[PDB]
Design a protein around this ligand. Sequence first.
Ligand code: DGI
Ligand code: DGI
Ligand code: DGI
Ligand code: DGI
Ligand code: MN
Ligand code: MN
Ligand code: MN
Ligand code: MN
Ligand code: MN
Ligand code: MN
Ligand code: MN
Ligand code: MN
Ligand code: MN
Ligand code: MN
Ligand code: MN
Ligand code: MN
Lengths: 100, 92, 94, 99
Amino acid sequence: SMPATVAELQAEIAAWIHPLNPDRRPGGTIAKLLEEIGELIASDRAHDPLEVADVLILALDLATLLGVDVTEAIRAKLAINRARSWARADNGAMRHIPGS
Amino acid sequence: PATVAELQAEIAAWIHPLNPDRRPGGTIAKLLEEIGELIASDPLEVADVLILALDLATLLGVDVTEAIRAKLAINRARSWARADNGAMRHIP
Amino acid sequence: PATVAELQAEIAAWIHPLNPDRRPGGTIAKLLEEIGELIASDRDPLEVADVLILALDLATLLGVDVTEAIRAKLAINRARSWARADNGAMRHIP
Amino acid sequence: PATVAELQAEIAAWIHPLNPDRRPGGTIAKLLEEIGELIASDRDPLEVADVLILALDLATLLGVDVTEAIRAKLAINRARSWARADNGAMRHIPGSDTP
Ligand SMILES: Nc1nc2c(ncn2[C@H]2C[C@H](O)[C@@H](COP(=O)(O)OP(=O)(O)O)O2)c(=O)[nH]1
Ligand SMILES: Nc1nc2c(ncn2[C@H]2C[C@H](O)[C@@H](COP(=O)(O)OP(=O)(O)O)O2)c(=O)[nH]1
Ligand SMILES: Nc1nc2c(ncn2[C@H]2C[C@H](O)[C@@H](COP(=O)(O)OP(=O)(O)O)O2)c(=O)[nH]1
Ligand SMILES: Nc1nc2c(ncn2[C@H]2C[C@H](O)[C@@H](COP(=O)(O)OP(=O)(O)O)O2)c(=O)[nH]1
Ligand SMILES: [Mn+2]
Ligand SMILES: [Mn+2]
Ligand SMILES: [Mn+2]
Ligand SMILES: [Mn+2]
Ligand SMILES: [Mn+2]
Ligand SMILES: [Mn+2]
Ligand SMILES: [Mn+2]
Ligand SMILES: [Mn+2]
Ligand SMILES: [Mn+2]
Ligand SMILES: [Mn+2]
Ligand SMILES: [Mn+2]
Ligand SMILES: [Mn+2]
């Protein structure tokens, strides 16, 4: 499929990792995710799709381990984000402004 | 279930008007904040991490399906050892 | 001059009244936020300060003698062999 | 207890022969690896040591006087007001600087 559904990508990731690390857990997955984000930061390569892939392989598989429906969770939080008020943070991302 | 590209389009359509000069560096900064929240904590928190990780791919122009499949093909040909943190490291 | 233990004491004296039940998990979470800010910065001693304030306080919360722990791990590191990793740091050879 | 500058000097004297052209980017990358190890630990001082070795060497590479920088930021933090965040740490209240 092209583009694949996020669940199909999770399944392809899991088909690779499950024979090798069937009882992997969220904590070790987050630890590896931080390693791979580090590699992306340090990457001198103007384009590094394989380092982005490492980050996404772990983030999508984290969702699998936590039983999270990626489509439902992302759309539910985007709906929350649309209803929120926002201000820019110094790092260039945003932070929401509390209502009640 | 949505395609990864459709979720990228929905994320970008929300953040782009609010943050028109968003960059990979600030996206990575925020991603690290949200991973911290997950450590300290949960589907909506996982959502925060994925919203930022997928938008980083958008900003870097990475075809997610193609890149993940390419790296999984590399990972299949590698041999692996279990790391102390419970994840793996490939054997050089 | 002030030692790492004295900086830990100064940090603890500031944060403890504000966050009397602070714990390693939230401190690691805040440390990740501040490393992110350092990454995104376009400059930055005060962002480095934010990282070190949290990392030194993490050692305090975990009961770690910073001088002795650093010197003990450096001694382990001297006994290892090292390869250059793609990110520009090193990884020891098993 | 050693001064932070002395610990930085010992760290630098160890790593510089092995990695003389090391940079902040790779040091941050490794720092994140070692923080991850602390998160996943089912235990420890040597893991805390890995984090601090890299965070202090980062300060060296960026030319930061650690004692001066930490004291300057603590002074700023004392003048701020603070709210507790959901992760258990604090975030300063915007606009609350005591003048
Ligand atoms: N892609 C993208 N998402 C962003 C950016 N700034 C904030 N966000 C989103 C990511 C998360 O879904 C959400 C986090 O909101 P925030 O105020 O920390 O609140 P919280 O939801 O973590 O409690 O905001 C940004 O610059 N880019
Ligand atoms: N989902 C998942 N992926 C894992 C785990 N351990 C390793 N991986 C994958 C994520 C990346 O695609 C890859 C990283 O390999 P590694 O030996 O650091 O090498 P590198 O490819 O970063 O150079 O391995 C793990 O425990 N879970
Ligand atoms: N300052 C500095 N320290 C470095 C660098 N590359 C590796 N190190 C040190 C930091 C830690 O004390 C140690 C981490 O070793 P590693 O092979 O991951 O093994 P481990 O000790 O985490 O099991 O190596 C580097 O580039 N700079
Ligand atoms: N040790 C410790 N320090 C904390 C905690 N919560 C916040 N801080 C400190 C660390 C940094 O010096 C500072 C971060 O402040 P913040 O409101 O993100 O603002 P900023 O200084 O990053 O702009 O606050 C906390 O729970 N523990
Ligand atoms: Mn990688
Ligand atoms: Mn790696
Ligand atoms: Mn790499
Ligand atoms: Mn969040
Ligand atoms: Mn947040
Ligand atoms: Mn949260
Ligand atoms: Mn901050
Ligand atoms: Mn900042
Ligand atoms: Mn800061
Ligand atoms: Mn370590
Ligand atoms: Mn390590
Ligand atoms: Mn370890």
